[PDB]
Amino acid sequence: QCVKLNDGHFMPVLGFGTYAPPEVPRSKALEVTKLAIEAGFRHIDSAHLYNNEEQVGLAIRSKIADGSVKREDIFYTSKLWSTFHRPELVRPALENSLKKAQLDYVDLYLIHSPMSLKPGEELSPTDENGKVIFDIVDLCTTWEAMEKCKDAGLAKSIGVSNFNRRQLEMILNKPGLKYKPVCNQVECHPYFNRSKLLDFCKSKDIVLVAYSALGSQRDKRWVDPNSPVLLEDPVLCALAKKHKRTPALIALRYQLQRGVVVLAKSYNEQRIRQNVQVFEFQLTAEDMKAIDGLDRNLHYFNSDSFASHPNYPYSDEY
Ligand SMILES: NC(=O)c1ccc[n+]([C@@H]2O[C@H](COP(=O)([O-])OP(=O)(O)OC[C@H]3O[C@@H](n4cnc5c(N)ncnc54)[C@H](OP(=O)(O)O)[C@@H]3O)[C@@H](O)[C@H]2O)c1
Numbered sequence: 001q002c003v004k005l006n007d008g009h010f011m012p013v014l015g016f017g018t019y020a021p022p023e024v025p026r027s028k029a030l031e032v033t034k035l036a037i038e039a040g041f042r043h044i045d046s047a048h049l050y051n052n053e054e055q056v057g058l059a060i061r062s063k064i065a066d067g068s069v070k071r072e073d074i075f076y077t078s079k080l081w082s083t084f085h086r087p088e089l090v091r092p093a094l095e096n097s098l099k100k101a102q103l104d105y106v107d108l109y110l111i112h113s114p115m116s117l118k119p120g121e122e123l124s125p126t127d128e129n130g131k132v133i134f135d136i137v138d139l140c141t142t143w144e145a146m147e148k149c150k151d152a153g154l155a156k157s158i159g160v161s162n163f164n165r166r167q168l169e170m171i172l173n174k175p176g177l178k179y180k181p182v183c184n185q186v187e188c189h190p191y192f193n194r195s196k197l198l199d200f201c202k203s204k205d206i207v208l209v210a211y212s213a214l215g216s217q218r219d220k221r222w223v224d225p226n227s228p229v230l231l232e233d234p235v236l237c238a239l240a241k242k243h244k245r246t247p248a249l250i251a252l253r254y255q256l257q258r259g260v261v262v263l264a265k266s267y268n269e270q271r272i273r274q275n276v277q278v279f280e281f282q283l284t285a286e287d288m289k290a291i292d293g294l295d296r297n298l299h300y301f302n303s304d305s306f307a308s309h310p311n312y313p314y315s316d317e318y
């Protein structure tokens, strides 16, 4: 079921990823989120970026209205987009997310990325030459606004996404800090298992939440299509055969036994239901060690433009 956060709240260890590319109809987000809840998902991951908060919130309201769940049975996450890092913009961002989702509070509000962008209403602002426009913001002040969001009872918990150890320390060592981040949501899978960052986070009682745990959606706008397909991995498949499960299930179970909270996106009803089966079996100490050895220092996120961002979390590479 759950893990206790450092603010005394609880996060379910399996979460449902709601993002789908824009070629997919937006109503589909409503339909598949109802499916995920119907299947046993209680943690739902969304964001302003995904442009789907209305539909995900409608799914949540739907399953509350028909009596399948209470609001407090549901752990709902949303994220502050990078055009709203400047501190006076943060609460308005959160209030707009709540208005779109028609919810009174999010269970978790995150800084979506440390890579600040030009303030405004374009989510992807570009210049006359079509290059992305960065902004420069002290994320400590952004965090202070996030803390006020918790105090105002608008977010149950607060945390970050896409921070490295350096950027976590920055918040952690902030003068007059009220709340540490409850989690850090980062790309994490057997080819990028983030063991160093994971050990740091545990040291700080900060939950690590894995995204692209299944190797990503391999959107060729943001991922090199010829990168290895995570779920076609020899070891994962051999393990799949050993446990009579699927590579996806092995990849998911892997994170759970490391103490990583794990996300899984699917827009396919059968795969949504297969994924909750992660709780049906266990991997041995020997199996875990074998998956550890798969690490290739490979993040699927690939973008030349964002790599030159000052706060690009992976800038040590290069
Ligand atoms: N920067 C960030 O904070 C960030 C970045 C990325 C993701 N995230 C969040 O966390 C989630 C991370 O997932 P992701 O979008 O990167 O993709 P993912 O969870 O790694 O899944 C990748 C693909 O795996 C397929 N899949 C799912 N279950 C499967 C199964 N049992 N067997 C085989 N294939 C299966 C899905 O395809 P189908 O739809 O066809 O089933 C999906 O497109 C996102 O949805 C989003 O909520 C956050």
Ligand SMILES: CCCc1n[nH]c2c1[C@@H](c1cc(OC)c(O)c([N+](=O)[O-])c1)C(C#N)=C(N)O2
Residues within 6 Å of the ligand: 019, 047, 049, 112, 113, 187, 212, 216, 217, 218, 219, 222, 223, 300, 301, 302
């Ligand atoms: C604008 C669309 C960007 C996009 N389309 N396909 C992608 C992205 C990247 C992404 C960035 C995110 O917040 C910075 C994010 O939250 C999510 N998400 O939730 O799926 C995805 C990404 C990564 N990592 C990978 N592997 O594929």
